mmCIF file of all heavy atoms in Angstrom:
data_model
loop_
_atom_site.group_PDB
_atom_site.id
_atom_site.type_symbol
_atom_site.label_atom_id
_atom_site.label_comp_id
_atom_site.label_asym_id
_atom_site.label_seq_id
_atom_site.Cartn_x
_atom_site.Cartn_y
_atom_site.Cartn_z
ATOM 1 N N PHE A 24 83.748 -107.657 81.239
ATOM 2 C CA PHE A 24 83.389 -106.946 82.528
ATOM 3 C C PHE A 24 83.793 -107.772 83.704
ATOM 4 O O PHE A 24 84.276 -107.150 84.693
ATOM 5 C CB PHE A 24 81.910 -106.693 82.523
ATOM 6 C CG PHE A 24 81.563 -105.332 82.011
ATOM 7 C CD1 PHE A 24 82.361 -104.689 81.039
ATOM 8 C CD2 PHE A 24 80.442 -104.680 82.461
ATOM 9 C CE1 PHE A 24 82.049 -103.478 80.564
ATOM 10 C CE2 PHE A 24 80.131 -103.361 81.991
ATOM 11 C CZ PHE A 24 80.937 -102.783 81.052
ATOM 12 N N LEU A 25 83.647 -109.058 83.701
ATOM 13 C CA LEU A 25 84.189 -109.895 84.775
ATOM 14 C C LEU A 25 85.719 -109.763 84.877
ATOM 15 O O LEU A 25 86.211 -109.721 86.030
ATOM 16 C CB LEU A 25 83.901 -111.437 84.545
ATOM 17 C CG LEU A 25 82.432 -111.824 84.695
ATOM 18 C CD1 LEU A 25 82.199 -113.196 84.084
ATOM 19 C CD2 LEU A 25 81.993 -111.776 86.203
ATOM 20 N N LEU A 26 86.376 -109.674 83.743
ATOM 21 C CA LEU A 26 87.788 -109.355 83.832
ATOM 22 C C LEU A 26 88.044 -108.073 84.571
ATOM 23 O O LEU A 26 89.010 -107.923 85.368
ATOM 24 C CB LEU A 26 88.395 -109.327 82.442
ATOM 25 C CG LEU A 26 89.848 -108.954 82.389
ATOM 26 C CD1 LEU A 26 90.782 -110.000 83.120
ATOM 27 C CD2 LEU A 26 90.394 -108.704 80.983
ATOM 28 N N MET A 27 87.181 -107.109 84.339
ATOM 29 C CA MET A 27 87.434 -105.754 84.959
ATOM 30 C C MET A 27 87.106 -105.716 86.450
ATOM 31 O O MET A 27 87.526 -104.744 87.115
ATOM 32 C CB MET A 27 86.646 -104.706 84.187
ATOM 33 C CG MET A 27 87.199 -104.414 82.793
ATOM 34 S SD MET A 27 88.940 -103.891 82.877
ATOM 35 C CE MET A 27 88.851 -102.393 83.806
ATOM 36 N N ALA A 28 86.432 -106.780 86.965
ATOM 37 C CA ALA A 28 86.104 -106.753 88.375
ATOM 38 C C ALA A 28 87.353 -107.226 89.146
ATOM 39 O O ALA A 28 87.418 -107.043 90.375
ATOM 40 C CB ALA A 28 84.926 -107.696 88.672
ATOM 41 N N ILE A 29 88.340 -107.839 88.454
ATOM 42 C CA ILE A 29 89.376 -108.488 89.158
ATOM 43 C C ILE A 29 90.290 -107.444 89.763
ATOM 44 O O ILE A 29 90.643 -107.590 90.990
ATOM 45 C CB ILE A 29 90.219 -109.473 88.259
ATOM 46 C CG1 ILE A 29 89.355 -110.648 87.847
ATOM 47 C CG2 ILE A 29 91.423 -109.971 88.980
ATOM 48 C CD1 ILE A 29 90.046 -111.556 86.875
ATOM 49 N N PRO A 30 90.767 -106.456 89.026
ATOM 50 C CA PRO A 30 91.783 -105.552 89.651
ATOM 51 C C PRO A 30 91.280 -104.865 90.955
ATOM 52 O O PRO A 30 92.075 -104.725 91.884
ATOM 53 C CB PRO A 30 92.041 -104.480 88.539
ATOM 54 C CG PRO A 30 91.033 -104.662 87.524
ATOM 55 C CD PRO A 30 90.584 -106.140 87.566
ATOM 56 N N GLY A 31 90.024 -104.534 91.064
ATOM 57 C CA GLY A 31 89.486 -104.020 92.258
ATOM 58 C C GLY A 31 89.352 -104.995 93.383
ATOM 59 O O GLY A 31 89.736 -104.670 94.513
ATOM 60 N N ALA A 32 88.932 -106.226 93.067
ATOM 61 C CA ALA A 32 88.845 -107.278 94.054
ATOM 62 C C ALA A 32 90.184 -107.687 94.614
ATOM 63 O O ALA A 32 90.286 -108.004 95.785
ATOM 64 C CB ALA A 32 88.188 -108.505 93.430
ATOM 65 N N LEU A 33 91.252 -107.579 93.798
ATOM 66 C CA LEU A 33 92.561 -107.999 94.178
ATOM 67 C C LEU A 33 93.386 -106.937 94.865
ATOM 68 O O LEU A 33 94.023 -107.141 95.924
ATOM 69 C CB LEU A 33 93.284 -108.506 92.930
ATOM 70 C CG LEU A 33 94.662 -109.155 93.144
ATOM 71 C CD1 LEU A 33 94.625 -110.209 94.273
ATOM 72 C CD2 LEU A 33 95.238 -109.707 91.857
ATOM 73 N N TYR A 34 93.365 -105.758 94.247
ATOM 74 C CA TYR A 34 94.207 -104.564 94.639
ATOM 75 C C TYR A 34 93.415 -103.435 95.346
ATOM 76 O O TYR A 34 94.033 -102.395 95.709
ATOM 77 C CB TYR A 34 94.901 -103.965 93.471
ATOM 78 C CG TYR A 34 95.816 -104.868 92.688
ATOM 79 C CD1 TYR A 34 95.459 -105.406 91.434
ATOM 80 C CD2 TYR A 34 97.080 -105.123 93.181
ATOM 81 C CE1 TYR A 34 96.273 -106.180 90.729
ATOM 82 C CE2 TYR A 34 97.952 -105.960 92.449
ATOM 83 C CZ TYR A 34 97.543 -106.455 91.239
ATOM 84 O OH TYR A 34 98.386 -107.277 90.487
ATOM 85 N N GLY A 35 92.136 -103.605 95.532
ATOM 86 C CA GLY A 35 91.383 -102.506 96.101
ATOM 87 C C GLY A 35 91.179 -101.454 95.054
ATOM 88 O O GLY A 35 91.700 -101.546 93.971
ATOM 89 N N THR A 36 90.361 -100.474 95.286
ATOM 90 C CA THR A 36 89.973 -99.445 94.267
ATOM 91 C C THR A 36 90.573 -98.090 94.507
ATOM 92 O O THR A 36 90.337 -97.167 93.765
ATOM 93 C CB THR A 36 88.433 -99.279 94.216
ATOM 94 O OG1 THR A 36 87.919 -99.010 95.530
ATOM 95 C CG2 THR A 36 87.787 -100.566 93.661
ATOM 96 N N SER A 37 91.490 -97.977 95.501
ATOM 97 C CA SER A 37 91.978 -96.649 95.821
ATOM 98 C C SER A 37 93.411 -96.419 95.245
ATOM 99 O O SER A 37 94.004 -95.319 95.391
ATOM 100 C CB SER A 37 91.996 -96.425 97.315
ATOM 101 O OG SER A 37 92.962 -97.223 97.943
ATOM 102 N N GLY A 38 93.981 -97.417 94.575
ATOM 103 C CA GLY A 38 95.284 -97.235 93.929
ATOM 104 C C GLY A 38 95.143 -97.319 92.419
ATOM 105 O O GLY A 38 94.032 -97.130 91.887
ATOM 106 N N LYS A 39 96.231 -97.581 91.709
ATOM 107 C CA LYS A 39 96.268 -97.559 90.288
ATOM 108 C C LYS A 39 96.680 -98.939 89.702
ATOM 109 O O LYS A 39 97.650 -99.467 90.150
ATOM 110 C CB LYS A 39 97.245 -96.487 89.781
ATOM 111 C CG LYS A 39 96.872 -95.074 90.057
ATOM 112 C CD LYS A 39 95.654 -94.657 89.245
ATOM 113 C CE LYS A 39 95.158 -93.330 89.804
ATOM 114 N NZ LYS A 39 96.280 -92.423 90.117
ATOM 115 N N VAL A 40 95.909 -99.460 88.726
ATOM 116 C CA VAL A 40 96.283 -100.749 88.194
ATOM 117 C C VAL A 40 96.930 -100.644 86.786
ATOM 118 O O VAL A 40 96.863 -99.587 86.148
ATOM 119 C CB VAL A 40 95.045 -101.695 88.148
ATOM 120 C CG1 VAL A 40 94.412 -101.756 89.478
ATOM 121 C CG2 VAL A 40 94.046 -101.261 87.090
ATOM 122 N N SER A 41 97.453 -101.752 86.348
ATOM 123 C CA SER A 41 98.124 -101.766 85.005
ATOM 124 C C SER A 41 97.128 -101.449 83.875
ATOM 125 O O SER A 41 95.978 -101.988 83.934
ATOM 126 C CB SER A 41 98.747 -103.160 84.764
ATOM 127 O OG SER A 41 98.665 -103.392 83.361
ATOM 128 N N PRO A 42 97.519 -100.686 82.874
ATOM 129 C CA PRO A 42 96.674 -100.490 81.663
ATOM 130 C C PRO A 42 96.354 -101.776 80.970
ATOM 131 O O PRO A 42 95.440 -101.739 80.147
ATOM 132 C CB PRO A 42 97.636 -99.665 80.781
ATOM 133 C CG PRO A 42 98.622 -99.046 81.712
ATOM 134 C CD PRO A 42 98.757 -99.948 82.873
ATOM 135 N N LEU A 43 96.996 -102.936 81.263
ATOM 136 C CA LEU A 43 96.692 -104.157 80.494
ATOM 137 C C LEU A 43 95.310 -104.776 80.888
ATOM 138 O O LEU A 43 94.722 -105.575 80.102
ATOM 139 C CB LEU A 43 97.762 -105.232 80.757
ATOM 140 C CG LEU A 43 99.110 -104.838 80.205
ATOM 141 C CD1 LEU A 43 100.194 -105.805 80.746
ATOM 142 C CD2 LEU A 43 99.168 -104.823 78.677
ATOM 143 N N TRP A 44 94.797 -104.403 82.033
ATOM 144 C CA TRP A 44 93.459 -104.805 82.322
ATOM 145 C C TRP A 44 92.477 -104.312 81.243
ATOM 146 O O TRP A 44 91.618 -105.064 80.805
ATOM 147 C CB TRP A 44 93.022 -104.262 83.714
ATOM 148 C CG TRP A 44 93.734 -104.899 84.803
ATOM 149 C CD1 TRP A 44 94.774 -104.342 85.567
ATOM 150 C CD2 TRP A 44 93.619 -106.266 85.275
ATOM 151 N NE1 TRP A 44 95.254 -105.246 86.447
ATOM 152 C CE2 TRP A 44 94.570 -106.462 86.271
ATOM 153 C CE3 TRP A 44 92.788 -107.309 84.833
ATOM 154 C CZ2 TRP A 44 94.710 -107.680 86.965
ATOM 155 C CZ3 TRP A 44 92.957 -108.533 85.613
ATOM 156 C CH2 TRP A 44 93.947 -108.704 86.589
ATOM 157 N N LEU A 45 92.670 -103.064 80.825
ATOM 158 C CA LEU A 45 91.815 -102.504 79.840
ATOM 159 C C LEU A 45 92.034 -103.089 78.409
ATOM 160 O O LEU A 45 91.066 -103.272 77.671
ATOM 161 C CB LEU A 45 91.999 -100.943 79.746
ATOM 162 C CG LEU A 45 91.351 -100.143 80.837
ATOM 163 C CD1 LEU A 45 91.510 -98.635 80.516
ATOM 164 C CD2 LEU A 45 89.895 -100.480 80.966
ATOM 165 N N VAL A 46 93.275 -103.367 78.133
ATOM 166 C CA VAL A 46 93.673 -104.045 76.883
ATOM 167 C C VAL A 46 92.975 -105.388 76.819
ATOM 168 O O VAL A 46 92.404 -105.773 75.778
ATOM 169 C CB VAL A 46 95.207 -104.089 76.759
ATOM 170 C CG1 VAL A 46 95.587 -105.033 75.626
ATOM 171 C CG2 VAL A 46 95.789 -102.677 76.617
ATOM 172 N N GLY A 47 93.063 -106.141 77.946
ATOM 173 C CA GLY A 47 92.382 -107.421 78.020
ATOM 174 C C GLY A 47 90.858 -107.247 77.844
ATOM 175 O O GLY A 47 90.233 -108.009 77.130
ATOM 176 N N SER A 48 90.306 -106.294 78.556
ATOM 177 C CA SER A 48 88.856 -106.119 78.447
ATOM 178 C C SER A 48 88.414 -105.756 77.017
ATOM 179 O O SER A 48 87.431 -106.349 76.516
ATOM 180 C CB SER A 48 88.389 -105.007 79.453
ATOM 181 O OG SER A 48 87.022 -105.017 79.562
ATOM 182 N N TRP A 49 89.087 -104.847 76.325
ATOM 183 C CA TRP A 49 88.735 -104.570 74.964
ATOM 184 C C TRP A 49 88.947 -105.783 74.042
ATOM 185 O O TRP A 49 88.061 -106.048 73.165
ATOM 186 C CB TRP A 49 89.470 -103.320 74.428
ATOM 187 C CG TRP A 49 88.673 -102.098 74.541
ATOM 188 C CD1 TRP A 49 87.442 -101.883 73.953
ATOM 189 C CD2 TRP A 49 88.942 -100.954 75.350
ATOM 190 N NE1 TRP A 49 87.012 -100.649 74.289
ATOM 191 C CE2 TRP A 49 87.858 -100.081 75.175
ATOM 192 C CE3 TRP A 49 89.950 -100.614 76.220
ATOM 193 C CZ2 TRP A 49 87.783 -98.848 75.832
ATOM 194 C CZ3 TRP A 49 89.914 -99.363 76.898
ATOM 195 C CH2 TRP A 49 88.786 -98.525 76.656
ATOM 196 N N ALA A 50 89.999 -106.535 74.295
ATOM 197 C CA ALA A 50 90.253 -107.770 73.549
ATOM 198 C C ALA A 50 89.045 -108.724 73.586
ATOM 199 O O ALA A 50 88.685 -109.299 72.540
ATOM 200 C CB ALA A 50 91.485 -108.478 74.074
ATOM 201 N N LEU A 51 88.516 -108.916 74.745
ATOM 202 C CA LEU A 51 87.399 -109.853 74.915
ATOM 203 C C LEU A 51 86.097 -109.354 74.232
ATOM 204 O O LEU A 51 85.459 -110.080 73.523
ATOM 205 C CB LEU A 51 87.097 -110.138 76.397
ATOM 206 C CG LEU A 51 88.179 -110.947 77.036
ATOM 207 C CD1 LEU A 51 88.155 -110.775 78.577
ATOM 208 C CD2 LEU A 51 88.025 -112.399 76.622
ATOM 209 N N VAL A 52 85.713 -108.114 74.530
ATOM 210 C CA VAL A 52 84.456 -107.560 74.054
ATOM 211 C C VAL A 52 84.517 -107.441 72.502
ATOM 212 O O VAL A 52 83.459 -107.671 71.895
ATOM 213 C CB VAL A 52 84.126 -106.194 74.693
ATOM 214 C CG1 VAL A 52 85.056 -105.061 74.183
ATOM 215 C CG2 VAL A 52 82.689 -105.802 74.456
ATOM 216 N N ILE A 53 85.641 -107.187 71.915
ATOM 217 C CA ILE A 53 85.751 -107.055 70.494
ATOM 218 C C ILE A 53 85.738 -108.468 69.869
ATOM 219 O O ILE A 53 85.276 -108.651 68.743
ATOM 220 C CB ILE A 53 87.042 -106.359 69.998
ATOM 221 C CG1 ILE A 53 87.068 -104.902 70.541
ATOM 222 C CG2 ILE A 53 87.124 -106.325 68.483
ATOM 223 C CD1 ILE A 53 85.863 -104.086 70.176
#
């Protein structure tokens, strides 16, 4: 979840980020 806070903090929340954020997040939680 901390990983998932980064794309918004860095790029703002009104655009689109790389799918790898999610891949990373699932990697950690699993």
Side-chain angles (χ1 to χ4, degrees):
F24 268 27
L25 289 164
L26 176 64
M27 287 303 297
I29 295 176
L33 188 51
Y34 299 105
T36 53
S37 71
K39 293 294 167 39
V40 306
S41 151
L43 296 167
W44 292 106
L45 283 187
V46 168
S48 194
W49 263 297
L51 289 162
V52 72
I53 299 304

